[PDB]
C-alpha cells in the first residue's frame, strides 16, 4: 500500500477551553491541526490497519455511508506489558476500557479483538455512543494526550456532493463529548475496522504546537479561524486582532535564522581528579 | 438437611415424567436444578420454579407446593437422558446439601 | 486475617458520613487524618482490606506496634493515612453451623512484607526435619483456627474490621469532597463559589445561550461574568458589586 | 505590505537589513 | 466464553497434601462466587467449599472441616484449595463451578451454580 495524502484546508479546530464567548477574537496556544497541511489518506477497500505513532495528537475522520469505521486502540507496548486505552465502540454501546491486552496479533471485529483479561482501572462503559441519496456522514475525531485527560473532541456533519473522496471546504468546530481522566503513556495508535465480511476511507492527521485566532459568534460558536504560521497575511491578521486588515505596511515578526549544529569545545586534558585524596582522606584536619 | 430422591424413573417418550425432591420443612427456600449428561459437563435448567436460564426451552419447568419440588419435562426425547440433581440452600447449617440424582431413561 | 481482599475504588463521590450509622460500640481511630477534616484532601485510590481480627489486639494495629496478630498476617509501615473501624456483629457471624469458617495463621520463618498477602499451601517446617506432608512431630499445620460460639464474653466476639489506605500519586482530579449546597440567592451582591470560582458579585440570570458543554461565560475583558447553575441547569450573570467614587 | 482584505489577498514581504542574499526580487535601501 | 481452567491432581499417598487451582478467563473476577464441589464416580456429587466475590468463606461439610483450606486471589484471578490428611473416601472429580448472580450487598443467602468445568481426577491410594 502506497498511502497517498490529501489536503486539510480548514479542518480540526476544536474548543480549547470551556468558556462562552460572544463576538470576541481570542488567540489560544494549544495543539491544533495546521491549515492546508498533509493528511494521510489510508483507504479501506483491500483494507488497512497500520501502527501509526500517536506523537502528540491525531485528527481522525471518516467519509462513508455505512458504520464499518468504529473503534480505536491506544498504548505504547500493546503486548500486555503496559496499559491501554482502547475506544471500542458499536451501535448504542461504548466499550471504552483501560485494561491491557495482547489482542491476538492485530485487532479486528463480537469481542474477537482481545483474548485476555487483567485488572481494569475504569468503568466508563457508559451507553451514549460517539457515532437520503448521497448524504455521506463525515465524523471528525481529535485525540490528545494531556497530562490527565484524553481530550476526545469530535463531531458529525453531512456532506452532499458525490465528488471523489476529499475533505470538504468548510469550517466546523468540535465540541467535547467524553473526557475520561485516565493517564497512560501513549505512543502508538490503531483504528478498529469492523470486519463484517458476511469500502471507506479514514483520514489520519497529526497535531503540532500552533497559534490560532478563533472568532466566536453571538450564539457562542467558532465560525472561522485563521492560523498565524501559514502565510504573511495570516500573521498580519494575527498581530492585529481583526479578520480584515487595512491598506498599509504592518510589522508582524522578525526573521531569525536558526542554528544547525551544536559545537562543544572543551580542553583536551584527560586525567583523573585527585578527589580520593581530599574526600576519601585517611586523616582529616581541625 | 437431607433430600429424598427416587432411585430411577422411567417413562415412555410420549408423556411427561415426575422428578420430585422433598424434605422436612422446605416450603419457602429456593430450589435449583441441574442436568448432567454422562461424560459431559453439567448444565443449568429451570431454577427457583419461576424462571429459566438463557437457552433452556419451555419444555422444562418447576413447581413447588408445600414440601415437594417437581421438575416437569415436556416432550421427553432420547437426547434428554441424563442425571437430574436438585439443590437446596438450608441456611440453618451453612452448607449445600445435594442428593442422589435420578437416571431418567426414556 | 491473612487472606484479605483488596478492593480498588474509582472516580466517584465518597460521603464519609454513613460510616457511623451501623451498630454501636465501634471505634473510629484515624492515623494522620481526622474525621472532621476528612473531606478536605484529595486522594486518587482508596483500598479497603477486610479481616476478622478480634480480641485485645485491635489496639496494636498501628504503624510501629508489634503484637501477636499483626506480626505475620498484616504489616503496615510508618505511612498509613486512614481510619480503622472495628464494629461488632454478633448476630450473623457467630453461629453453631461451623466453627472453622474463619482461619488464623501463626509465626513463619520470616517476617511478612507490608501490604503483601501470604497465600501458601505448604506445611510449616521446624528448620531441620523431614516433613513429607504428614502431621507429625515438629511438622504441623500453622493455620491454627478458633471456634465461634455465642457464649463467650465481649473479648471473643467476632469484630468486623476494615482499614482504608489513602494514596497520592500523579493522577487527575479524583474523589475529593462528597458535595456542597447553600441554596443560592438571586439579585443581591453576595459571595459565590459556583464550581471553583470564588468571586463576589450579583446574580441576574441573563438570557444568553450557552452551549451544552460551555460552563464559564468570560468576556472581552477576561473576566467571568456568566456561570452555569450546577444543580438545576440555568445561565446566570455574575456582575460585580456596586462601587464608585465619592466627591465632597 | 497588504492592500487590504477588501481587494485581494496578495501580500508583499519586506525584510529589514538584508541584501536579498541572507534571507520578482527587489533590493531597496 | 467462560474458561475455568482447573489444575492439580494425580496419584498421592494417603495422608499427604496437595494444592488444586481454578483460574477464570472471560469474565471479571470481582463480582462472582466460585465453589469447589466434588463428584464421586457414579455416586452423585458432594459440595466441598466455596468463596463469594470477595475474600469470604461460606462454610464446609460435616467431614472436611479442619482438613481443607480454600483461598481466593483477585490479583492473579484464581481460586486455590489446599488439602490435608487425605483418606480413601476422598477420590472424586473436584469440579470448579461459578455463580450466576452478581451477589449484591442486601439480599438473601442463596448461591447456585451457573457454569461447570471438566474436573481433575485426584486419586488417593
Ligand atoms: C443564533 O441563534 C439564534 C436563535 O436561534 C438565531 O436567531 C441566529 O440566527 C443564530 N445565528 C447564527 C446561526 O449564526
Ligand atoms: C439535580 O436534582 C434536581 C432535583 O431532583 C433536578 O431538578 C436537577 O435536574 C438535577 N440536576 C442534575 C445535575 O442532574
Ligand atoms: C549588497 O551587495 C552589493 C554587492 O555588489 C553591494 O553593491 C550593495 O551595496 C549591498 N547593499 C547593501 C544593502 O549592503
Neighbours of A201 (CB within 10 A): 18
Residue E57's domain comprises 5-124
- The CATH fold of domain A5-253: Jelly Rolls (2.60.120)
Q: What are phi and psi of E96, to 5 degrees?
A: -110, 100
Q: Is C95 on the interface with B (CB under 8 A)?
A: yes
Q: Beta strands C190-194 and C82-83: pairing type?
A: unpaired
On whether any CB of chain E is under 8 Å from the CB of C196, the answer is: no
**Cα–Cα distance measured from residue A91 to residue A194, given in angstroms and rounded to the nearest whole number:** 12
CA of C231 to the centre of ligand 2 (A): 5
The dihedral of CA E27, E30, E31, E34: what is its sign?
A: positive
Q: Residues C214-243, buried b or exposed e (16+ Cβ, 10 A)? A: bbbbbeeeeebbbbbeeeeeebbbbeeeee
Distance from CA of C115 to the nearest CA of A (A): 18
- Residue of E74, E72, E91 whose CA lies nearest to E82: E72
Does the beta carbon of C181 sit less than 6 angstroms from any atom of ligand 2?
no
Buried b / exposed e along E1-31 (16+ C-beta atoms within 10 A): eeebebebeeebeeeebbbbbbbbeebebee
Distances, alpha carbon B86 to alpha carbons A72, B60, B66, C171, E61, in Å: 47, 14, 16, 51, 17
CA dist B101 and E45 (Å) reads: 9
DSSP C73: S
d(CA E58, CA E33): 10
Number of domain units in chain E: 1
Q: How far is the CA of D6 from the centre of ligand 1 (A)?
A: 26
Chain A 41-100, CB below 8 Å of chain C: which residues? none
Q: For ligand 2, say whether the CB of C232 is within 6 Å of any of its atoms.
A: yes
Domain positions in chain A: 5-253
Ligand 3 geometric centre to CA of A257 (Å)? 20
Contacts of A22 in chain C (CB under 8 A): 208, 219
| Short-list A110, A6, A98, CA closest to A59 | A6
Nearest CA to ligand 2 atom 8: C232
Which among C7, C121, C132 has CB closest to E19? C121
Q: Which residue of A97, A112, A119 to mutate against E (max E Cβ within 10 Å)? A: A119
Count of A-E CB contacts under 8 Å: 7
| Residues of E in Cβ contact (< 8 Å) with A120 | 28
Distance of alpha carbon C188 from alpha carbon C204, whole angstroms: 9
Q: Name the residue at shortest CA distance from atom 12 of ligand 2.
A: C231
CATH code assigned at E42: 2.60.40.10
Question: What is d(CA A249, CA D13) in angstroms, rounded to the nearest whole number?
Answer: 9
Residues 6+ apart with CB under 8 A from C40: C177
CB contact under 8 A, E110 and B47: no
The H-or-E segment that residue C31 falls in is: strand C30-31
For residue A208, what is its C-alpha cell?
503540532
Q: Give the SS3 label for residue C191.
A: strand
Question: Which domains does chain B possess?
Answer: 8-106 (2.60.40.10)
What's the per-residue H, E or C state across chain E? CCCCEEECCCEECCCCCEEEEEECCCCCCCCCCEEEEEECCCCCEEEEEEECCCCCECCCCCCCCCCEEEEEECCCCEEEEEECCCCHHHCEEEEEECECCCCCCCCCCCCCECCCCCCEEEEEC
Pocket test for ligand 1, best of A215, A219, A220, A222 (most atoms within 8 A of CB): A219
Q: Is residue A22 within 6 Å of ligand 1 at its C-beta?
A: no
Q: Render chain A in DSSP notation, one character per residue.
A: ----EEE-TT--EE--S-B--SS-EE---SEEPPTT-EEE--EE--------B-SSEEEE--EESS--EEEEEEESS-SSSS-B----EETTEE---------SSS------S-------------S------S-EEEEEEEEE--SS-----EEEEEE---PSS---S---EE-------------EEEEEE------EE--B---EE--EEEEEPTTS-EEEEEESSS-HHHHHHHHTT-SS--SB-------------------------THHHHTT-SS---
The tally of CA atoms less than 13 A away on the side-chain side of residue A201 is 15
Q: Residue C231: CB within 6 Å of ligand 2?
A: yes
Chain B nearest-CA distance from E58, in A, is 7
Strand B31-36 relative to strand B43-44: parallel, antiparallel, unpaired? antiparallel
Q: Name the nearest CA neighbour of A8 among A172, A190, A193.
A: A172
DSSP code at position C107: -
Question: Phi-psi category of D4—alpha, beta or left, where left has phi over 0 and alpha has psi -120 to 50?
Answer: left
**C-alpha cell belonging to residue A164:** 471523489
Amino acid at each position: 500500500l502506497p498511502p497517498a495524502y490529501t489536503n486539510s484546508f480548514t479542518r480540526g479546530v476544536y474548543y480549547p477551553d470551556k468558556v462562552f464567548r460572544s463576538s470576541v477574537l481570542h488567540s489560544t496556544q494549544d495543539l491544533f491541526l495546521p491549515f492546508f497541511s498533509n493528511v494521510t489518506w489510508f483507504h479501506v477497500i483491500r483494507f488497512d490497519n497500520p501502527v501509526l505513532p500517536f506523537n502528540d495528537g491525531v485528527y481522525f475522520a471518516s467519509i462513508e455511508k455505512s458504520n464499518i469505521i468504529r473503534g480505536w486502540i491506544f498504548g505504547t507496548t500493546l503486548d500486555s506489558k503496559t496499559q491501554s486505552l482502547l475506544i471500542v465502540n458499536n451501535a448504542t454501546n461504548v466499550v471504552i476500557k483501560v485494561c491491557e491486552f495482547q489482542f491476538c496479533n492485530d485487532p479486528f471485529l463480537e469481542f474477537r479483538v482481545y483474548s485476555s483479561a487483567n485488572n481494569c482501572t475504569f468503568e466508563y462503559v457508559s451507553q451514549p455512543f460517539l457515532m437520503q441519496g448521497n448524504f455521506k456522514n463525515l465524523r471528525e475525531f481529535v485525540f490528545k494526550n494531556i497530562d490527565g485527560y484524553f481530550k476526545i473532541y469530535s463531531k458529525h456533519t453531512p456532506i452532499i456532493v458525490r465528488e471523489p473522496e476529499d475533505l470538504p471546504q468548510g469550517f466546523s468546530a468540535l465540541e467535547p463529548l467524553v473526557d475520561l481522566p485516565i493517564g497512560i503513556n501513549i505512543t502508538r495508535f490503531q483504528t478498529l475496522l469492523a470486519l463484517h465480511r458476511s469500502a471507506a476511507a479514514y483520514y489520519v492527521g497529526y497535531l503540532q504546537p500552533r497559534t490560532f485566532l478563533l472568532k466566536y459568534n453571538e450564539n457562542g460558536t467558532i465560525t472561522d479561524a485563521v492560523d498565524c504560521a501559514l502565510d504573511p497575511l495570516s500573521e498580519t491578521k494575527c498581530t492585529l486582532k481583526s479578520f480584515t486588515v487595512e491598506k498599509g505596511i504592518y510589522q508582524t515578526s522578525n526573521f531569525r535564522v536558526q542554528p544547525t549544529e551544536s559545537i562543544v569545545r572543551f580542553p583536551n586534558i584527560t586525567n583523573l581528579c585527585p578527589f580520593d585524596e581530599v574526600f576519601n582522606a585517611t586523616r582529616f584536619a581541625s | 438437611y437431607e433430600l429424598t430422591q427416587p432411585p430411577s424413573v422411567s417413562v415412555a417418550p410420549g408423556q411427561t415424567a415426575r422428578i420430585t425432591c422433598g424434605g422436612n420443612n422446605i416450603g419457602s427456600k429456593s430450589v435449583h436444578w441441574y442436568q448432567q449428561k454422562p461424560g459431559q459437563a453439567p448444565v443449568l435448567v429451570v431454577y427457583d420454579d419461576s424462571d429459566r436460564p438463557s437457552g433452556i426451552p419451555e419444555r422444562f419447568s418447576g413447581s413447588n407446593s408445600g414440601n415437594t419440588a417437581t421438575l416437569t419435562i415436556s416432550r421427553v426425547e432420547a437426547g434428554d437422558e441424563a442425571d437430574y440433581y436438585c439443590q437446596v440452600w438450608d441456611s440453618r447449617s451453612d452448607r449445600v446439601v445435594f442428593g442422589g440424582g435420578t437416571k431418567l431413561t426414556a | 486475617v491473612y487472606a484479605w481482599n483488596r478492593k480498588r475504588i474509582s472516580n466517584c463521590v465518597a460521603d464519609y458520613s454513613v460510616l457511623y450509622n451501623l451498630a454501636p460500640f465501634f471505634t473510629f481511630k484515624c492515623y494522620g487524618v481526622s474525621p472532621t477534616k476528612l473531606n478536605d484532601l484529595c486522594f486518587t485510590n482508596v483500598y479497603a482490606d477486610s479481616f476478622v481480627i478480634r480480641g485485645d489486639e485491635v489496639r496494636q494495629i498501628a504503624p510501629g506496634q508489634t503484637g501477636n496478630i499483626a506480626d505475620y498476617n498484616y504489616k503496615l509501615p510508618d505511612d498509613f493515612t486512614g481510619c480503622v473501624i472495628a464494629w461488632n456483629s454478633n448476630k450473623l457471624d457467630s453461629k453453631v453451623s461451623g466453627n472453622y469458617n474463619y482461619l488464623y495463621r501463626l509465626f513463619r520463618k520470616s517476617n511478612l512484607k507490608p501490604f503483601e498477602r501470604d497465600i501458601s499451601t505448604e506445611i510449616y517446617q521446624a528448620g531441620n526435619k523431614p516433613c513429607n506432608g504428614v502431621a507429625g512431630f515438629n511438622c504441623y499445620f500453622p493455620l491454627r483456627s478458633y471456634s465461634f460460639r455465642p457464649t463467650y464474653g465481649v473479648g471473643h466476639q467476632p469484630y468486623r474490621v476494615v482499614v482504608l489506605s489513602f494514596e497520592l500519586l500523579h493522577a487527575p482530579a479524583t474523589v475529593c469532597g462528597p458535595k456542597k449546597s447553600t441554596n443560592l440567592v438571586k439579585n443581591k451582591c453576595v459571595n459565590f463559589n459556583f464550581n471553583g470560582l470564588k468571586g463576589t458579585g450579583v446574580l441576574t440570570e441573563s438570557n444568553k445561550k450557552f452551549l451544552p458543554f460551555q460552563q464559564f461565560g468570560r468576556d472581552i475583558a477576561d473576566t467571568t461574568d456568566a456561570v452555569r447553575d450546577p444543580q438545576t441547569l440555568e445561565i446566570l450573570d455574575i456582575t460585580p458589586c456596586s462601587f464608585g467614587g465619592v466627591s465632597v | 505590505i497588504t492592500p487590504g482584505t477588501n481587494t485581494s489577498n496578495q501580500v508583499a514581504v519586506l525584510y529589514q537589513g538584508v541584501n536579498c542574499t541572507e534571507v520578482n526580487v527587489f533590493q531597496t535601501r | 466464553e467462560v474458561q475455568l481452567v482447573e489444575s492439580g491432581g494425580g496419584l498421592v499417598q494417603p495422608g499427604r497434601s496437595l494444592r488444586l487451582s481454578c483460574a477464570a478467563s472471560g469474565f471479571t473476577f470481582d463480582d462472582y462466587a466460585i465453589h469447589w464441589v466434588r463428584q464421586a464416580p457414579g455416586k452423585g456429587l458432594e459440595w466441598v467449599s466455596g468463596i463469594t466475590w470477595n475474600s469470604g468463606t461460606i462454610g464446609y461439610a460435616d467431614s472436611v472441616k479442619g482438613r481443607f483450606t480454600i483461598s481466593r486471589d483477585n490479583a492473579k484471578n484464581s481460586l486455590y484449595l489446599q488439602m490435608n490428611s487425605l483418606r480413601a473416601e476422598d477420590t472424586a472429580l473436584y469440579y470448579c463451578a461459578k455463580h450466576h448472580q452478581i451477589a449484591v450487598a442486601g439480599d438473601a443467602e442463596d448461591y447456585y451454580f451457573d457454569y461447570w468445568g471438566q474436573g481433575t481426577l485426584v486419586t488417593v491410594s
